[PDB]
Design an enzyme around this catalytic site. Structure first.
Site, PDB file in Angstrom:
ATOM      1  CE  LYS A 187      23.381  93.503  27.097  1.00  9.81           C
ATOM      2  NZ  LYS A 187      24.110  92.472  27.890  1.00  9.81           N
ATOM      3  CG  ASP A 235      26.358  90.238  25.555  1.00 10.17           C
ATOM      4  OD1 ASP A 235      26.796  89.126  25.174  1.00 10.17           O
ATOM      5  OD2 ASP A 235      25.536  90.346  26.491  1.00 10.17           O
ATOM      6  CD  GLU A 262      29.409  89.307  27.458  1.00 15.94           C
ATOM      7  OE1 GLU A 262      29.310  90.553  27.560  1.00 15.94           O
ATOM      8  OE2 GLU A 262      28.681  88.512  28.096  1.00 15.94           O
ATOM      9  CG  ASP A 274      29.192  85.259  30.431  1.00 17.03           C
ATOM     10  OD1 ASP A 274      29.376  84.718  31.545  1.00 17.03           O
ATOM     11  OD2 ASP A 274      28.228  86.026  30.222  1.00 17.03           O
ATOM     12  CE  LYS A 287      27.570  86.796  33.538  1.00 13.60           C
ATOM     13  NZ  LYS A 287      26.418  86.815  32.599  1.00 13.60           N
TER      14      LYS A 287
END
Lengths: 368, 368, 368
Positions: free
Chosen positions: A164, A193, A217, A240, A264
């Site tokens: 992250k 990410d 990401e 995403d 998701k």
């Protein structure tokens, strides 16, 4: 002839193992909704909707339960086996609100699986209950802290790592990326990410300063901004949070904005919608993380059925929501992590049955 | 744990009612170890219509047979992946195999195919007529006859090197329709872009034009230059062709034919895509008996009404029937699919004749 | 130094005059520490029209309430940023909050909203009629009645799966208008691209067509192929959708509705963009009382005359009035906004009933 007879809504207060302290809030817990769908023939399905707080996506706990209230009169009397039809009715009666729709769809899939005597991974077309690699979550810090956390994660048996990064200081992101990419153990993979924390300017500056060609990401907030960055840098881009419906994926594809997406169910509106996206991704050669937004092993199992039925070349690591919770309302049930891998159940339907005595008293109930 | 045990290939010489005077059809029986048995039909409209022919279909089954034996037929996407791995293209070969596995899955699930494809009801589907080419009032004679039969949509075959007669055909037919009725002009790749542009811009009629030209590129060119809705068909062999058509903006509808696209699993993805982008669709097969007609009708009936146009029944053009009183038939210009588990049509092998090929699993200690 | 002190939520069951037979409206009172009080209304047109519903609106206020308490309501962009941070999407929730903060700012400034939105005068704004669907001369009957009332623009509801009746509707209405009068054909997403192309290219009328299809992509397709001006509405949820519409060249006008776009601060930016690119705009709200109508009318009146078309008043369709003699009303087919500071409408809480929710600031030494 099969007919939805009762919808029962439960509310779960799920403390996190690691609370974190927001600038606006001590982010402490998740507001999960369990939904039980009863039919006239005694076959019962369960779904979960658990948004990652109320700031992550267009989704919140109180809105989820309010949405179910609105939809309930229209879901009563439906055949839950006719899945595309159930989705059509939901979309007719309440546009958007994909977070409301996901546990309703999930519970209908559960019913269909039990009626057919098939596990969800088989209904989704998979050959086997394929064990799916699980990724670690590496919290932001120094170069040496994150690389220590990675060695810790490797010892637990994680081989894929979500590091992250992000923030508007470019020089520390460069030093993070270059340390983590060069100090991976052999065979291991990183995704960096960013979680929308960059503007296009910062993204272009850090990614063109860096030798690392690992996955990035969702660097920016919108698809437009992300496609801009992708034209200007050399890394694979994973999208995403900007992908709310099928037409957004179609848009991402035609712009050439990405080489991968996360899918998701709570973002896209259930398993029916998520499967169409999955199949699209296979057709265009996307590589895909398939997981849910958060919550218990109930939601985690639903998405892992989709993950396992996805061809090996297109499937990447899954994340398990329940790994980050301090409580468990369904102990020893659903898909769990053993040595860096998780396998879906092969029982008919979803293969996880909540006990209502563990769940508290229902917050709402609807029947006709 | 369910496994394919035997594949049996039948060949059917079917005479046409209006004489190229016969069809080469292939029936395929797939047996399992638990005694559940599925049927598929592949019947190309001659060998000159699509990349498809009878002898090639059986040679294709021969090539694929060793790889199908021992597969779980309920795992439908996996079965399609193996077929694509082991014989690329040849969608006409794969159509009956996938059809028969859908049949098995439906029987195993206890569900009719239209429900497995998500539909709420065995919806009666409007059937269209075929009006063969002639003079204006020859074709206007044949439409009145079809209207008398209960057809409310008509597919009028036009085309040629001569613009003037096609103009006279179109304007007479379109003005001289009975009220409530629809006409589609099927040119079937007979025009060059030049003729398409001249004809369609000389004409007041704004009815559907079905596949004016040979290729996607040529059709997209015509569409930019004319005022009619354009329907695509013969140029679309896989999902990527449909994606290309949408991105070019080439059409407002597609025909979906399982024998062109490689069966029901591939046809469903296309169908779902078409619903997403607002296409209207004719869903039918390329030719043959009520077996292949029924499989396509299950897909047609499960399609949202806003996106569904009239189906064509191939068996209406045959003198012979190998499966009498079975499957989906015309009743006053409507056809309802069956609601028995699976396909809802079971051939008698005695009516078909002696199998042209059979493929089996063999023991390891076996000797001649 | 001004601070939000209390948020009070009211729920209003409003019967419709022509019966789905009632509306779920939410009134919101926002109190400050210096005694200046603002009002907002959010009233979705049922739960099936937009991604919007009554119960979701109040659950949204519940979610947002802790974060609104203690904010300076004069800092309008900041208030919108916090709301976007704390609940993404849900523009129907944010509309009343932003509305009530505009109200406060106007009272604090001593200025009516149309002046804060830059306009020179309380300009009387033309009002349009709603003509419900029927036969040609049914709708032509209803237009003459609306003309008698003093309506000079008319919004005629059309659409369906049947091209022939929509053609007959359009050509009769467009030729049989009284002189000086305008008609907009509102199809409201009822057409596929195929039907839109067939209908609009069979028709001599070149009047406005409002939102023919479901999506931006589908509407842009129709526009490339037809001769009518296209008005966009329901597909535009945020500023980025308007940007995408302009870059696609999809339209020549947009409807701006505060409840769709997230209130007056968001509506103004869209308005200013539309003026820059030469759009003509209908500026109105989605439904509800003269409270929401007045807020939209302040924006409408402040719009340059070249870019402003007729407004629609939601309250004209209700049997009940909670705020009698207040706000912007129809006078011979014109409405003038008030010139009192702020919104210029103050509800009596006695006419509304008992608050369904209230949110307050609390003392740190407090005990139950």
């Amino acid at each position: 002839s099969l007919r939805i007879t009762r919808l029962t809504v439960f509310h779960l207060d799920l403390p996190l193992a690691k609370p974190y302290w927001l600038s606006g809030l001590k982010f402490d817990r998740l507001d999960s909704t369990y939904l039980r769908i009863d039919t006239d023939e005694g076959v019962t399905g369960w779904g979960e909707g658990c948004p990652w707080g109320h700031s992550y996506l267009p989704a919140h706990g109180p809105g989820l339960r309010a949405g179910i209230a609105t939809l309930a009169p229209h879901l009563l009397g439906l055949d839950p086996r006719s899945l595309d039809h159930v989705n059509r009715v939901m979309d007719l009666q309440l546009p958007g609100h994909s977070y409301v729709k996901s546990p309703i769809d999930m519970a209908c899939w559960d019913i269909l699986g039990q009626v057919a005597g098939l596990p969800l991974w088989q209904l989704l077309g998979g050959e086997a209950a394929t064990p799916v690699p699980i990724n670690s979550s590496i919290s932001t810090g120094t170069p040496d802290q994150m690389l220590g956390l990675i060695a810790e994660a490797a010892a637990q048996g994680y081989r894929t790592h979500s590091a992250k990064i992000g923030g508007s200081d470019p020089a520390q992101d460069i030093a993070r990326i270059e340390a983590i990419s060069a100090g991976l153990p052999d065979g291991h993979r990183v995704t960096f990410d960013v979680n929308r924390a960059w503007t296009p300017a910062i993204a272009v500056e850090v990614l063109n300063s860096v030798r690392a060609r690992d996955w990035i990401e969702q660097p920016c907030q919108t698809l437009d901004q992300c496609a801009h960055v992708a034209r200007r840098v050399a890394n694979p881009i994973m999208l995403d949070e900007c992908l709310h419906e099928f037409s957004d994926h179609l848009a991402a594809w035609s712009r050439g904005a990405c080489e991968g997406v996360k899918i998701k169910p709570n973002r896209v509106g259930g398993l029916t919608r998520a499967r169409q996206i999955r199949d699209f991704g296979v057709s265009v050669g996307w590589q895909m993380h398939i997981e849910d937004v958060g919550g218990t092993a109930l939601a985690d199992t639903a998405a892992l059925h989709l993950a396992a039925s996805t061809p090996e070349a297109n499937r990447l690591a899954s994340w398990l929501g329940h790994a980050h919770l301090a409580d468990d309302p369904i102990p020893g049930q659903g898909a769990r992590n053993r040595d860096g891998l998780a396998t879906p159940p092969s029982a008919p339907g979803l293969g996880v049955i909540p006990d209502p005595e563990a769940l508290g008293r229902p917050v709402a109930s609807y029947d006709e």
